[PDB]
Amino acid sequence: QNVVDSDTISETAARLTGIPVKKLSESE
Amino acid sequence: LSKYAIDMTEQARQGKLDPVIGREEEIRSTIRVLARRIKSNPCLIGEPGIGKTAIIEGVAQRIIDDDVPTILQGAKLFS
Numbered sequence: 001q002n003v004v005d006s007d008t009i010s011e012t013a014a015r016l017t018g019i020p021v022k023k024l025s026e027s028e
Numbered sequence: 029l030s031k032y033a034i035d036m037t038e039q040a041r042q043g044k045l046d047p048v049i050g051r052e053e054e055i056r057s058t059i060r061v062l063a064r065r066i067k068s069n070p071c072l073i074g075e076p077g078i079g080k081t082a083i084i085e086g087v088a089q090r091i092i093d094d095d096v097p098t099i100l101q102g103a104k105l106f107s
């Protein structure tokens with residue numbers, strides 16, 4: 001697959017830096 | 029390298045390894061970091077006893093079990 005902006009980045013960052021806040025939920 | 033390090037992967041091939049649970053997620057993170065082109069080095073940081081050695085063995089298992097993309101799959105892991 002491809003890298004998708006904030007989608008991939010927010011998840012990636014949260015996984016390493018913490019801050020799941022930016023992931024957005026599968027269901028709020 | 030064997031003069032300077034222990035081939036953790038080979039030990040894992042020979043068993044001599046204690047399986048992990050839960051920590052698969054940090055292992056997946058480890059694989060994802062290793063898969064990076066620039067900052068290729070993941071580091072396990074936290075309290076003593078958490079299972080960071082256990083994670084690195086978990087990494088060896090993923091290598092042994094072929095659960096890792098080829099570019100890391102063939103890796104030889106050393107202590």
Ligand SMILES: Nc1ncnc2c1ncn2[C@@H]1O[C@H](COP(=O)(O)OP(=O)(O)OP(=O)(O)O)[C@@H](O)[C@H]1O
Nearest residue numbers: 046047048049051075076077078079080081082083
């Ligand atoms: N999933 C797991 N989580 C925690 N411990 C595990 C796990 N699987 C196996 N273990 C066993 O529990 C111990 C975890 O110790 P480990 O060395 O990882 O602690 P550590 O995080 O490295 O801190 P240390 O530097 O005091 O060893 C190991 O002796 C390992 O055999």
